[PDB]
Ligand binder design. Structure first.
Ligand code: BCB
Ligand code: BCB
Ligand code: BCB
Ligand SMILES: C/C=C1/c2cc3[nH]c4c(c3C)C(=O)[C@H](C(=O)OC)c4c3nc(cc4[nH]c(cc(n2)[C@@H]1C)c(C(C)=O)c4C)[C@@H](C)[C@@H]3CCC(=O)OC/C=C(\C)CCC[C@H](C)CCC[C@@H](C)CCCC(C)C
Ligand SMILES: C/C=C1/c2cc3[nH]c4c(c3C)C(=O)[C@H](C(=O)OC)c4c3nc(cc4[nH]c(cc(n2)[C@@H]1C)c(C(C)=O)c4C)[C@@H](C)[C@@H]3CCC(=O)OC/C=C(\C)CCC[C@H](C)CCC[C@@H](C)CCCC(C)C
Ligand SMILES: CC(C)=CCC/C(C)=C\CC/C(C)=C/CC/C(C)=C/CC/C(C)=C/CC/C(C)=C/CC/C(C)=C/CC/C(C)=C/CC/C(C)=C/CC1=C(C)C(=O)c2ccccc2C1=O
Ligand code: HEC
Ligand code: HEC
Ligand code: HEC
Ligand code: HEC
Ligand SMILES: CC(C)=CCC/C(C)=C/C=C/C(C)=C/C=C/C(C)=C/C=C\C=C(C)\C=C\C=C(/C)CC/C=C(/C)CCCC(C)C
Ligand SMILES: COC1=C(OC)C(=O)C(C/C=C(\C)CCC=C(C)C)=C(C)C1=O
Ligand SMILES: CCCCCCCCCCCC[N+](C)(C)[O-]
Ligand SMILES: [Fe+2]
Lengths: 246, 273, 323, 332
């Protein structure tokens, strides 16, 4: 009997066991977790385990370095109700229009997403005249759009197709009682044979859908603004949606 | 202690129960009612494990094993030392898992995103119930359930398989394994494809959706598409257990012979026998 | 409910896109055709396909292997076609039953098996060149090819390298539905229970991990399809609310998060490590470990259980016991 | 393609190891009805008179019995083996000492064999023992026997299909499969392990690390041995109507002590018993039997586990006649 002895005769499998654990913890902690921190770090309100910024060469000229320095612009649209770091923040206005919480868009670039050959990717069928709806599916052009409150909010005028993936991403509708169209992502649309059902927002809220700068094309930030508005509605279309369900 | 883009998303709302009372964060963690719920069941479960371990031979975490009762006790309650601990811990585990799932719903609602993750997370909870609850009920004893030990649970899977002579011939298992393999392959392919487009090498330019579709059309003559590969992945992963469940439940309650012999329905058809 | 996460309500049709590669554009064969029913749950377009030399080489070598297998299987039922269809799952092409060491076995006892294996290997190698070269032709990274290489290395380990290292072709995997499955038990038994091989453990951890990760990742992207989460490339180069919401969902749930890029690295690593861990386990088996259960006992890692029925001594060890 | 619940379950290992039997009650019931046909013992008789060794002329085995006892043995033997043909299956009526009918010399060897089971193989048959009936079940040909190649049906009272017949080469894989519980394992465990004592059933090394001198090239046993042992274990399992966990903790198939049940030690003695029966009593009867009873290699029918057990862990659910017929053994 000896102080410092272990009941372990070393063999090659035992060696490879320790090596394997070493490789796993090295790849996870020192590589994968380092890659995980390229967005949203450094933290606000530590630095020594962040990687050096990564540069991408974009398809259509230019470079982007991540993380982007573009600042967050919704800071004054929420107020610290409480001293505790963990407390939710209070909107200062109409959070649906101010674009906070689930109505938040990202500071995405004011560029038109492009096809491999440099054309605008997401365009209405009035521009993409070589695109059609498949034989057997609902052509929604002419059909009414019913909002959450049962009121008809407008009429479908067009579909916006992704020319890169051959996939419809938005409906354009004439908004009843205005001169304007609005976009709605297909993901917020129940397509029936005689109507489009939208449970996301009330009929009156189609008035304040973010507006496109241009009529026949959309920027990446605009896509985010439009998409976020309807998601805002899930929590804020009525006062009782933000409240607990049960 | 916030991500650079996080502050604008930290609003009140989306809770299912309690309103404002539990609507807050501790560091990065959302709480909610189901947060408090989860931490209760976790604290209770880990305590019962510690209490069981203290009565057993060893403190080595890889030798610890809290086992269900002998078959004798049927669906009744058992002494703590003799399987009661096992029963208590199973209830806490269910409590913790269901809490965790409903907490994910509250987080989904606050962010205004689909509930797809907590829905997907119901599949492994179901499978845990099939092994620990539904199958033992149909056989009339808690003693058929698997024990809570890191190595002891492997000895249970092993003996369970060999109770049906060759478990590989189980048709539910054949399906389950097929989904495990194709799922692991598809994740490799999907992960590899995204990395290949964003990191082509050598200061060359990031490629496109069109490049992604072209690559697979060239290699196999079809590309499923960007949205669809995510739906397929959830489908393949989920079916590991949705098909597996029928092979597990069938073993004992609906079939008592070896699994190879089951294929008799095919082999023993009179017209080629 | 986002019904788009279940199926495509309205399908688009448009002109067939072709992205040009540095070579091979002229080796694309077939007219694309659209399927309305496929188009519900994916892209409607089938074809065209790229041929090239590696494609044709792979099909030629593969077909040779299948023909050798099918003919030996037909031989096993003495070319009765009805029995062939009946007994198919039970039919196989076997490695040598006798010990010829690394000696080339005779045709009747392993030679055909060895030939079928050679052609399968040349098929896999050809397909690898296809997967690698198509990536280079389109200006893409070779991440898929290196994942595929680990899968091929694992097949080489069970088919060729392990048999070589212990010096017997008898250890190879049979060709056949039930016969390849029967090998799993014969091998586990010979080497003292694969549950007690730590590399079996790692491989299963990563495989289960692939299930968890693709369910989580698949579900996360459908959950943010409303915000174009599926457009993963431009979300990498220009972070949108899709992947901000995706990151925060996970940060608020488990206390940490990936990026839309890094989660694909997690996926790729987990997939790769299924095959790497399995390979290391096979390389160690028979070479440096004969019985995994007794190896765990030797290192104090194997659990013990009380008796239920009495402990049973080995009869072979009793005084006056026969052989 | 399914069996309705409930299922009967037993426990053969520590709680949580999922060790024990899984039985369909209808199947256990049908086997119980089959085995309940075991004729009752005949009324005991007083040992009145002298030994038949000096009354009758050709008694070489049962010479110690008195006339009344001996005639009782003969009436039992007749019920157990040839109830339809009667005493004349083995005997010329004109001379009860005549060895002129082939079943007579075989019956004598069978008395010797039955007494040797009940005396020399108590480690297997214990105090249950066997009679003629255990194997024969009321017919001269026992329903479950083995030739040196697999045959179907397993029960030779059932009529073969064209493809089951040993002559139809196309049915070989199915003849093998139905002997190994429908596995695809490409080995005949009867011929390899039960016909004689040439092969070792054990394949798993008893060291953690590979021993130098048995672990490379032609010094290694081929993997085919592991497959063959697996096939024997599939066969033994189906023959007893049980599963691996009746005898083993699958944690370590190769380990005894707490890792094996007493039934495994009894199974070990069973393998030695079957080899003794086959090598020393059954195989050599090819010289004494008509050509119509022999296989294609001129072999006599031989015994496996199923010959006695017929899908039950104890033959005839432990039914004994040992105290009713002490002349069948044991013999001190
Ligand atoms: C001798 C024994 C055999 C066997 C016996 C076996 C049995 C008895 C069963 C399977 C089953 C299965 N087998 Mg199988 N098997 C498999 C593969 C599989 C799986 C795909 C499948 C399902 C596993 C499961 O239920 O997980 C379950 C995992 C669960 C339930 C995880 C729940 C997670 C929980 C919700 C959350 C827990 C959280 C933590 C506590 C939190 C920790 C906190 C930390 C992280 C902070 C392969 C690939 C092979 C190979 C290569 O041979 C194989 C061989 C065998 N199997 C042997 C032949 N197998 C199952 C099946 O479906 O069969 C049809 C099954 O019942
Ligand atoms: C039907 C078949 C089953 C099965 C068959 C099986 C096999 C064959 C093998 C495992 C293995 C493992 N199993 Mg097991 N298993 C486990 C957990 C485990 C781990 C200890 C390990 C690796 C799993 C992994 O990486 O997954 C993917 C998940 C990942 C990567 C996320 C990280 C998970 C983390 C490592 C889990 C840690 C759990 C904790 C140690 C236990 C709880 C802690 C509490 C007290 C706070 C849980 C928590 C459950 C539950 C709750 O159902 C479960 C059910 C089953 N397993 C079924 C009974 N399992 C492997 C092993 O090495 O065991 C020694 C192994 O070879
Ligand atoms: C009793 C028998 C057991 C057993 C015996 C076993 C063995 C012998 C081996 C494994 C291995 C493994 N086991 Mg395991 N096992 C597993 C899971 C696993 C896998 C994760 C792992 C890796 C194998 C793999 O991915 O192959 C699927 C992927 C493959 C085969 C790659 C194929 C790629 C190739 C390029 C495809 C080519 C296709 C071509 C088109 C084909 C053309 C062919 C034509 C030309 C003829 C689970 C989840 C369980 C459970 C739940 O109990 C289990 C129980 C058992 N295993 C029992 C203990 N297992 C392996 C391992 O890890 O060992 C350490 C392994 O070698
Ligand atoms: C087909 C679908 C697949 C799938 C899918 C998904 N998987 C998900 C999600 C989705 C979608 C999530 O959204 C959720 C998550 O957050 O992701 C990070 C999650 C999670 N999947 C985990 C483990 C996991 N997934 C497995 C399998 C699959 N996942 C299959 C493959 C497996 C195995 C064995 O394969 C494991 C081990 C956790 C990490 C996490 C829950 C944490 C929890 O619930 O915390 C709450 C509970 C605790 C923190 C501890 C509770 C301790 C109890 C009270 C006491 C001990 C209990 C006892 C049972 C211990 C026995 C141990 C013994 C056997 C050794
Ligand atoms: C964890 C890592 C996982 C993993 C990873 C990866 N796996 C990959 C890749 C990666 C990265 C590729 O890049 C490559 C590929 O291209 O993906 C589309 C590939 C592959 N993985 C296949 C099968 C597979 N992976 C398995 C397992 C895992 N994979 C593990 C789990 C299993 C199991 C589980 O048994 C199976 C059966 C084939 C589809 C393919 C090879 C084709 C070949 O080598 O052909 C060579 C042979 C021929 C061309 C024969 C000719 C065809 C005849 C008529 C018979 C038809 C057979 C047909 C199936 C062939 C397809 C041709 C068709 C597409 C026109
Ligand atoms: C102040 C402070 C810091 C205190 C801390 C003290 C503490 C510990 C507790 C606080 C006490 C209280 C009161 C608690 C209340 C809150 C609460 C309920 C806490 C819970 C604590 C707890 C139980 C922690 C454990 C959490 C847990 C289950 C972790 C397991 C982690 C594991 C093993 C994960 C497996 C999956 C895996 C390998 C993931 C790695 C890669 C990742 C991160 C994938 C997730 C992910 C996916 C899937 C995407 O698709 C994606 C797409 C686009 C962007 C991002 C992502 C993304 O992040
Ligand atoms: C084959 C299964 C037998 C049947 C059926 C019957 N008998 Fe038999 N008998 C048999 C043998 C092998 C022997 C020799 C036993 C020995 O110890 O060596 C005998 C012997 C007799 C005798 C003694 C005759 C003599 O040697 O003089 C008698 C009287 C006799 N057997 C009678 C008998 C009757 C009445 C039977 C029907 C009830 C009967 N035997 C059946 C083998 C077989
Ligand atoms: C199993 C371990 C057996 C026991 C116990 C007894 N017998 Fe048997 N017997 C057995 C076999 C495998 C065979 C060969 C097949 C055959 O039918 O020949 C036999 C054979 C006989 C025969 C010859 C039958 C014939 O071919 O017509 C006879 C007459 C016979 N056995 C009699 C007999 C008696 C009297 C037994 C108890 C004392 C007895 N057998 C036991 C298998 C087994
Ligand atoms: C009792 C009725 C048994 C059942 C059911 C099964 N096995 Fe068995 N097994 C048994 C014995 C007595 C022996 C030793 C035989 C000898 O002559 O020494 C074995 C042996 C094995 C082995 C080999 C172990 C070794 O030391 O190398 C294995 C791998 C094995 N048995 C596995 C096995 C399986 C998978 C079974 C169900 C299909 C099974 N056995 C049933 C006794 C009994
Ligand atoms: C007739 C000559 C037999 C043959 C051939 C085999 N066995 Fe047997 N076995 C026989 C008897 C009479 C008994 C005793 C029943 C009793 O009440 O003791 C047994 C017992 C067993 C057991 C024990 C079952 C238990 O305890 O429940 C086992 C596990 C067993 N036998 C297995 C076995 C095997 C594997 C055989 C072929 C190698 C085999 N037996 C042959 C009678 C006969
Ligand atoms: C050193 C010298 C001299 C030579 C070296 C030779 C060499 C390197 C040999 C290597 C051999 C190898 C690696 C063998 C590996 C064999 C393996 C892993 C076999 C595994 C599985 C076999 C299976 C599943 C067989 C299935 C067979 C069939 C389905 C019959 C074929 C029929 C079909 C319809 C095609 C099946 C396609 C399938 C995907 C479903
Ligand atoms: C954005 O990501 C992805 C696509 O979009 C362009 C794909 O088209 C495919 C290819 C999918 C195919 C060919 C389906 C066939 C089945 C399997 C298991 C691959 C993968 C892997 C992918 O990741
Ligand atoms: C990727 C995570 C996987 C972790 C699972 C643990 C794997 C190591 C297994 C070591 C212990 C198992 N055993 C039986 C060999 O001792
Ligand atoms: Fe993705």
């Amino acid at each position: 009997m000896y102080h410092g002895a272990l009941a372990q005769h070393l063999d090659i499998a035992q060696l490879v066991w320790y090596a394997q654990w070493l490789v796993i913890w090295t790849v996870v902690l020192l590589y994968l977790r380092r890659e995980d921190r390229r967005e949203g770090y450094p933290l606000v309100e530590q630095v020594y385990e962040l990687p050096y910024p990564k540069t991408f060469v974009l398809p259509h000229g230019g470079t982007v370095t991540v993380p982007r320095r573009r600042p967050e612009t919704r800071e004054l649209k929420l107020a610290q109700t409480d001293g505790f770091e963990g407390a939710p923040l209070q909107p200062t206005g109409n959070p649906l229009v101010d674009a906070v919480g689930p109505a938040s868009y990202a500071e995405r670039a004011e560029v038109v997403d492009a096809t491999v050959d440099g054309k605008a990717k997401i365009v209405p069928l009035r521009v993409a005249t070589d695109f059609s709806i498949a034989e057997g599916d609902v052509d929604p052009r002419g059909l009414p759009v019913v909002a959450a409150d049962g009121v008809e909010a407008g009429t479908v005028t067009d579909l916006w197709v992704d020319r890169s993936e051959h996939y419809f991403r938005y409906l354009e509708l004439s908004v009843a009682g205005s001169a304007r169209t609005a976009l709605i992502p297909l993901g917020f649309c129940d397509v029936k044979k005689d109507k489009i059902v939208v449970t996301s927002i009330l009929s009156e809220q189609f008035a304040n859908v973010p507006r496109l700068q241009s009529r026949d094309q959309i920027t990446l930030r605009e896509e985010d603004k439009v998409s976020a508005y309807y998601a805002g509605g899930l929590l804020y279309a009525t006062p009782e949606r933000a409240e607990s369900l049960l | 202690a916030l991500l650079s883009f996080e502050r604008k998303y930290r609003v009140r709302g989306g809770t299912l129960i309690g309103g404002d009372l539990f609507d807050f964060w501790v560091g990065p963690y959302f709480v909610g009612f189901f947060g408090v719920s989860a931490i209760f069941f976790i604290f209770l479960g880990v305590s019962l494990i510690g209490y069981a371990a203290s009565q057993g031979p060893t403190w080595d975490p890889f030798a610890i094993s809290i086992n269900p009762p002998d078959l004798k006790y049927g669906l009744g309650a058992a002494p703590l030392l003799e399987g009661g601990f096992w029963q208590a811990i199973t209830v806490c585990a269910l409590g913790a898992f269901i809490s965790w799932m409903l907490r994910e719903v509250e987080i989904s609602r606050k962010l205004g995103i689909g509930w797809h993750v907590p829905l997907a997370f119901c599949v492994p909870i179901f499978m845990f119930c099939v092994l620990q609850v539904f199958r033992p009920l149909l056989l009339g004893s808690w003693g058929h359930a698997f024990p809570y030990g890191i190595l002891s649970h492997l000895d249970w899977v092993n003996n369970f398989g060999y109770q049906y002579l060759n478990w590989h011939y189980n048709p539910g298992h054949m399906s389950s394994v097929s989904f495990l393999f194709v799922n692991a392959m598809a994740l490799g392919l999907h992960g590899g494809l995204i990395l290949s487009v964003a990191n082509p090498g050598d200061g060359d330019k990031v490629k496109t959706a069109e490049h992604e579709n072209q690559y697979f059309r060239d290699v196999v003559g079809y590309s499923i598409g960007a949205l669809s590969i995510h739906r397929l992945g959830l489908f393949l992963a989920s079916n590991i257990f949705l098909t597996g469940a029928f092979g597990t439940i069938a073993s004992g309650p609906f079939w008592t012979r070896g699994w190879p012999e089951w294929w008799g329905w095919w082999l023993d058809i009179p017209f080629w026998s | 409910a986002d019904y788009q996460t279940i199926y495509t309500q309205i399908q688009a049709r448009g002109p067939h896109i072709t992205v040009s590669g540095e070579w091979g554009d002229n080796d694309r064969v077939g007219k694309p055709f659209y399927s309305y029913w496929l188009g519900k749950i994916g892209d409607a377009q089938i074809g065209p396909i790229y041929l090239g030399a590696s494609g044709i080489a792979a099909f030629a070598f593969g077909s040779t292997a299948i023909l050798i297998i099918l003919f030996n299987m037909a031989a096993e039922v003495h070319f009765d076609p009805l029995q062939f269809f009946r007994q198919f799952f039970w039919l196989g092409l076997y490695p040598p039953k006798a010990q010829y060491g690394m000696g080339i076995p005779p045709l009747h006892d392993g030679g055909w098996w060895l030939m079928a294996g050679l052609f399968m290997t040349l098929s896999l190698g050809s397909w690898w060149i296809r997967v690698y070269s198509r990536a280079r032709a389109l200006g893409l990274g070779t991440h898929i090819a290196w994942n595929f290489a680990a899968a091929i290395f694992f097949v080489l380990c069970i088919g060729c390298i392990h048999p070589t290292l212990v010096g017997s072709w008898s250890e190879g995997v049979p060709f056949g539905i039930w016969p390849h499955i029967d090998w799993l038990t014969a091998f586990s038994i010979r080497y003292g229970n694969f549950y007690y091989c730590p590399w079996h453990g790692f491989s299963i951890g990563f495989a289960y991990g692939c299930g968890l990760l693709f369910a989580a990742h698949g579900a996360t992207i459908l959950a943010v399809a409303r915000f174009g989460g599926d457009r993963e490339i431009e979300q990498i180069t220009d972070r949108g609310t899709a992947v901000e919401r995706a990151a925060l969902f996970w940060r608020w749930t488990i206390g940490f998060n990936a990026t839309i890029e890094s989660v694909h690295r997690w996926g790729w690593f987990f997939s790769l490590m299924v095959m790497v861990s399995a390979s290391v386990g096979i390389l160690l088996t028979g070479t440096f470990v004969d019985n995994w259960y007794l190896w765990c006992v030797k290192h104090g890692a194997a659990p013990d259980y009380p008796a239920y029925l009495p402990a049973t001594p080995d009869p072979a060890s009793l005084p006056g016991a026969p052989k | 393609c399914f069996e309705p619940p409930p299922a009967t379950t037993t426990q053969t290992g520590f709680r949580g190891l999922s060790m024990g039997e899984v039985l369909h009650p209808a199947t256990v019931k049908a086997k119980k009805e089959r085995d309940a046909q075991y004729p009752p013992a005949l009324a005991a008789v007083k040992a009145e008179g002298p030994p038949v060794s000096q009354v009758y002329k050709n008694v070489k085995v049962l010479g110690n019995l008195t006339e009344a006892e001996f005639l009782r043995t003969m009436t039992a033997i007749t019920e157990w083996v040839s109830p339809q043909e009667g005493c004349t299956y083995c005997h010329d009526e004109n001379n009860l000492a005549s060895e002129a009918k082939y079943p007579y010399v075989v019956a004598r060897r069978m008395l010797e064999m039955t007494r040797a089971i009940n005396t020399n193989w108590t480690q297997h048959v214990a105090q249950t023992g066997v009679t003629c009936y255990t194997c024969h079940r009321g017919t001269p040909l026992p329903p479950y026997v083995r030739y040196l190649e697999p045959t179907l049906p397993l029960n030779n009272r059932e009529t073969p299909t064209h493809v089951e017949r040993v002559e139809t080469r196309s049915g070989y894989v199915v003849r093998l499969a139905k002997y190994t519980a429908y596995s695809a394992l490409n080995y005949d465990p009867f011929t390899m392990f039960l016909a004689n004592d040439k092969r070792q059933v054990r394949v798993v090394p008893q060291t953690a690390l590979p021993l130098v001198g048995v672990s490379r090239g032609k010094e290694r046993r081929p993997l085919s041995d592991a497959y063959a042992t697996f096939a024997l274990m599939m066969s033994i399992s189906d023959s007893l109507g049980t599963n691996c966990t009746f005898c083993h903790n699958a944690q370590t198939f190769e380990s005894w002590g707490k890792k094996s049940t007493p039934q495994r030690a009894i199974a070990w003695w069973g393998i030695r018993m079957v080899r003794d029966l086959n090598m020393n009593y059954l195989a050599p009867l090819n010289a004494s039997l008509p050509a119509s009873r022999l296989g294609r290699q001129g072999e006599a029918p031989q015994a496996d586990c199923r010959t006695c057990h017929q899908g039950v862990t104890k033959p005839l659910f432990g039914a004994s006649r040992l105290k009713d017929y002490p002349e069948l053994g044991p013999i001190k």
